[PDB]
Design a binder for this molecule. Structure first.
Ligand code: CA
Ligand code: CA
Ligand code: CA
Ligand code: MN
Ligand code: MN
Ligand code: MN
Ligand code: MN
Ligand code: MN
Ligand code: MN
Ligand code: MN
Lengths: 230, 232
């Protein structure tokens, strides 16, 4: 079973598995049952931005999601990630649609990791047709507009249900080493969630996992393509 | 047949294949016979620093090698790398030894690529782990307990060995160009320590850019720096 650390943008309330009764963003530490969550005032059809950051001294994983012209949503959790994650990891984005759907379009994504100092940084303001520097899993694809469509969309751009997909950066990341003075990382991605459904689903996540991580079987829908069970 | 673009720190003069008659640094475009070279006043036993840069507007690949408290060595060559390299590549470092030898120790390596279609990739190693999962080690290349990358074999006692070849490629491919892109550039730097028991150290170290699936060619040892199958 993979080891997962993620920040979820949960658009669909799955109260039968721990979610609060409303769209929310949360911090998941080895389980879909977020250790911390904050109400997320979604704005489908509007481009949002998510920023995630962490450093080994403060030991506080934080995330902020926002849209232009509106107050943001933030969430944090005190945790020693070096204790949870292996020294080497791959970082990525995931998304899923189930009975209900939504577009899980990524317009841009950047990540920076520093180990005190060695470093890894990448930035995509648009994605290439054949992103050789990305590992596409499931239905994840990049469209003609240079955007990353984590889940299946029609020619018109209309979302489809029962879809799952993720994109991991090709190169493993060394997030920690013995005696390391300080290790830190931060990620940012812009997204566009659209949907005809009264209640869109299921969400998008930025996650960090073991380097050989793959879509767990039965991880569709509410499990955001990250966990095998609830 | 890989496509190679490299900046060579040629410590051994092989005049039989076009090398000038003195240690030198050079810019190689699909051939070991440098398109441009400059005399390299080596400081064996001293830590050196090499800097390589290029951008699609200026179209001038330049490299500078220096040591603390000494005059630097520079070499340049005008060339549109878009007419040579494929759109996706892997970057790396190579080194070899032949009858004569030398340590080809890399103490640090950084690289930055920018593509304004601006997308970018950047990595830096101030030390290397024993199990560098973000590096593709080829040939004899290995990282040591000191955290340094030994491109070519060195005895457990630190003494270099001849007839060795090794390379280290960064794991993720690099997108250096795309049609209609506005501008693209890359920057690379690495520090190295070349030590030798031989009056004439050989054969050299290089920073190269090649097709993503690049591998050490057969017969690329010694004077071929682990980059080419022949000296054509
Ligand atoms: Ca949910
Ligand atoms: Ca030579
Ligand atoms: Ca192209
Ligand atoms: Mn949730
Ligand atoms: Mn930040
Ligand atoms: Mn850096
Ligand atoms: Mn690209
Ligand atoms: Mn030469
Ligand atoms: Mn950048
Ligand atoms: Mn490392």
């Amino acid at each position: 079973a993979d080891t997962i650390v993620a920040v979820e943008l949960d658009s669909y309330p799955n109260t039968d598995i721990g979610d609060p009764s409303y769209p929310h963003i949360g911090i998941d530490i080895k389980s879909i049952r977020s250790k911390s969550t904050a109400r997320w005032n979604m704005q489908t059809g509007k481009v949002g931005t998510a920023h995630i950051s962490y450093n080994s001294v403060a030991k506080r994983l934080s995330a902020v999601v926002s849209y232009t012209g509106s107050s943001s949503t933030t969430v944090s959790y005190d945790v020693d990630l070096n204790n949870v994650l292996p020294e080497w990891v791959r970082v990525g984005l995931s998304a899923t649609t189930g009975l209900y759907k939504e577009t899980n379009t990524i317009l841009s994504w950047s990540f920076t990791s520093k180990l005190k100092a060695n470093s890894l940084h990448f930035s995509f303001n648009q994605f290439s047709q054949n992103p050789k520097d990305l590992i596409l899993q499931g239905d994840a694809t990049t469209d003609s507009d240079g955007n990353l469509e984590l889940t299946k969309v029609s020619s018109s751009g209309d979302p489809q249900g029962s879809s799952v997909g993720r994109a991991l950066f090709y190169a493993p990341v060394h997030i920690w080493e013995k005696s390391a003075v300080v290790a830190s990382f931060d990620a940012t991605f812009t997204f566009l969630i659209k949907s005809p459904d009264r209640d869109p689903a299921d969400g998008i996540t930025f996650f960090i996992a073991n380097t050989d991580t793959s879509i767990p079987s039965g991880s569709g829908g509410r499990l955001l393509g990250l966990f095998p069970d609830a």
